[PDB]
Amino acid sequence: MKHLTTMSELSTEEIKDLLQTAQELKSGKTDNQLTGKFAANLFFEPSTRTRFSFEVAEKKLGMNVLNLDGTSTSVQKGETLYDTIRTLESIGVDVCVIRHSEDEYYEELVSQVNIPILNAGDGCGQHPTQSLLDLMTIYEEFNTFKGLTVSIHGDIKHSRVARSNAEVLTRLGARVLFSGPSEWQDEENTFGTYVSMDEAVESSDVVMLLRIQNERHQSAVSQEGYLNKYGLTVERAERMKRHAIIMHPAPVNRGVEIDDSLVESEKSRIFKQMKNGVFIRMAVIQRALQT
Amino acid sequence: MKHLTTMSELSTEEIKDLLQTAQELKSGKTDNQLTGKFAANLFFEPSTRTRFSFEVAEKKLGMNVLNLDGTSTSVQKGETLYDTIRTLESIGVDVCVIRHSEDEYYEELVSQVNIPILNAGDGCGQHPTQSLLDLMTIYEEFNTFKGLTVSIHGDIKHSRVARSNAEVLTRLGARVLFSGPSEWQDEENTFGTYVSMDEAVESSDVVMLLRIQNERHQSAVSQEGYLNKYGLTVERAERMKRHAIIMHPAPVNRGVEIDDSLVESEKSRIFKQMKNGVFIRMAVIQRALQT
Amino acid sequence: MKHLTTMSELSTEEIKDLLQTAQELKSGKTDNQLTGKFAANLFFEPSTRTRFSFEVAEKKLGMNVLNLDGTSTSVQKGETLYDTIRTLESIGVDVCVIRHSEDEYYEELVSQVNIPILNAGDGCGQHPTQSLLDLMTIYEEFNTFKGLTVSIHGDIKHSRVARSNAEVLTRLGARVLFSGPSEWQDEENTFGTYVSMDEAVESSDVVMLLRIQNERHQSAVSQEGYLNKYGLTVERAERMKRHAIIMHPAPVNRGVEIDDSLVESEKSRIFKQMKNGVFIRMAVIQRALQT
């Protein structure tokens, strides 16, 4: 049994094995080892795109799926997450996928339960299958991480995914850049150099955009002028390297972080990421249940 | 890949093949051509009975099913319907069933996307599989549409299904009558002849009732006198033709559009329509995915 | 066709056959008799834990599953429960599991409908598959109910399951005791003898704990202090007989009705109950659909 909680808990070699298994699955490799086993999708915090992706993966592996969207009647009655998982084991669930509000909910969980937990997103915001599918997409494009320049743009401060991506990309030998409103930057980041979008589009092999939500303090950082000020405009995209790619974890705010016309332009790998997500999640599930 | 958006977009020949395929599936005919394929039921606007019927159809075809009930998190984050569908294609969904609040949401989509869209209901109220199962039920009863008299009753001008039925039944060789409050009539053609319920019950081979929504009711008195004034009372049903049938799309507002005692009477085919809905939806999915 | 409504409607022989069937299923007996058939889970009032258990049961029997969570669109459009079930029959559902807010909703339905209804909870609180899994767990431990002393603890007056359990245990030849705040006692109970927890722990073969909910309406009984004053403390548990067992339907309010350390202690069968729930539910489904 092998949980998946964070990228930092995986070895460079584990990452590469997962990417390789996903590529093989993407190529059509299939078996019946997991047919009839049970996966529970516990999306305490809803995320339809992520749940759908895991669900296709589970069903492509021949698994039965139990879905929970939003609050559980049990946790409403104060049930511990540990008891929830132990309940699932008792009824015959073999693997749990979890998206949950509590900060690092898994840390205590992982040593105490008897079935693998796959983190689909936590309170701190780690999202390891997103990182993995991102890595897979980059690797398919260039066949290496060494010496790549990867820029990541937007609310870096409040995207643990951005920061966990920067960290793992660094471990893999890539250089990382950040752009966005200065007030959304982590002032003390070991991984990545803060620069302007206008600089990054020219020096990058990979341009990774984040969704610009709407929340936090009074600073709404006008979504209206964001694209021009900070985002990937047509003019900025035109100055990208010939071989460079555009990535975005979705959903995309067209006209905000990116120009509506670029979402499906030739350098965009945005929908390819989504293709890859399923096979990554298949590989993560096989890893979870391998004996 | 064949979408299903509206009845008017189908030829009488296509309509007739769908009915025949449905009757064959209803007779027990099954195959494994769609086994393992994926359908997504995107019921942005909720309709439990319609979703259940499509879901039964998909599963009888051996398909994996992804369900979305109501609000999608992606959409809330501002995802376009086009992006939603493209996402579904990327994760490997083969056909999408959509019920959505936007008027003719499908019109733009069908030229843009690369998998079949099955319209389960749009903003304008087009509901083609409901029309097809109505047609199937009539066809099973009489074995032709040519020379039938079919009357449709209630809020005609605010029922896209009723007006689509009138038009398609006319194309098929039937004579259409309407009845209901004159203020709920849109007699700019609308393909049939406006009459009284009392007249139509005696001349009709088919009496099709519409749900009288509580919203189109002006008062609690308007609804309370409706049955006697406009609806299918016992006395009116007793004047029906020997071989005539009563139809209603459900759910039934008992005691309003029809007397409570008639819903499961000898001439009612209300529940048989629901049986037919599944086989119609199977035929429509097979049509969508035939190569 | 055999409905499951309440324990009082089963004979003691039917109860024993179900337990036997469940035990055989738990041992791995299986067949394809229900493969492809359709179960509808109509959880009008949510209970995630109960739905999950039924769903695993249904899926281990090879059945297709339709899930309804919370409000039904047609129900809110005023559809009677009878019409809903008749609708399900028409679309090809073979069995309905229902959890509904109305007192004895089943009583009218069962004389009217043509497919089996399995009550997963009504307005009164009758929950027969919970009683059955409790009985199974007890029977597995002692191979009999005759002469057993079973004690049940907490808010007896407001727990229909406790009272249903008391009555059926008595029918099966067992001796029932109650403990808890005297104000929560059903003084008019014919089936149980009221005693102190401190007495009950030493005389019981089975200690059944109830969840102590936060009521605060003449049930304001302080939750703090409850464990020491009324609950299963470590000290009380250590005075239980060597063969005796602890049971609880969950979710557990750790530190209230029971000490946190006792939930997974040697005498606890709390999680074993949850294992048994699936097989009991499989048994009840096979009974509904047999011959």
Curated annotation (Swiss-Prot), chains A, B, C:
Its EC number is 2.1.3.2. GO terms for molecular function: amino acid binding; aspartate carbamoyltransferase activity. Gene3D superfamilies: Aspartate/ornithine carbamoyltransferase (3.40.50.1370). It catalyses: carbamoyl phosphate + L-aspartate = N-carbamoyl-L-aspartate + phosphate + H(+). Pathway: Pyrimidine metabolism; UMP biosynthesis via de novo pathway; (S)-dihydroorotate from bicarbonate: step 2/3. Keywords: Phosphoprotein, Pyrimidine biosynthesis, Transferase. One of its GO terms (biological process) is 'de novo' pyrimidine nucleobase biosynthetic process. It holds the Pfam family OTCace_N. It comes from the Bacteria. L-aspartate binds at K77, R160, R211. Carbamoyl phosphate binds at R49, T50, R99, H127, Q130, A250, P251. It is an enzyme of class 2 (transferase). InterPro entries: Asp/Orn_carbamoyltranf_P-bd (IPR006132), Asp/Orn_carbamoylTrfase (IPR006130), Asp/Orn_carbamoylTrfase_sf (IPR036901), Asp_carbamoyltransf (IPR002082), Asp_carbamoyltransf_Asp/Orn-bd (IPR006131). Heterododecamer (2C3:3R2) of six catalytic PyrB chains organized as two trimers (C3), and six regulatory PyrI chains organized as three dimers (R2). Belongs to the aspartate/ornithine carbamoyltransferase superfamily. ATCase family. Catalyzes the condensation of carbamoyl phosphate and aspartate to form carbamoyl aspartate and inorganic phosphate, the committed step in the de novo pyrimidine nucleotide biosynthesis pathway. This is Aspartate carbamoyltransferase catalytic subunit. It comes from Bacillus subtilis (strain 168). The lineage of its organism: Bacteria, Bacillati, Bacillota, Bacilli, Bacillales.
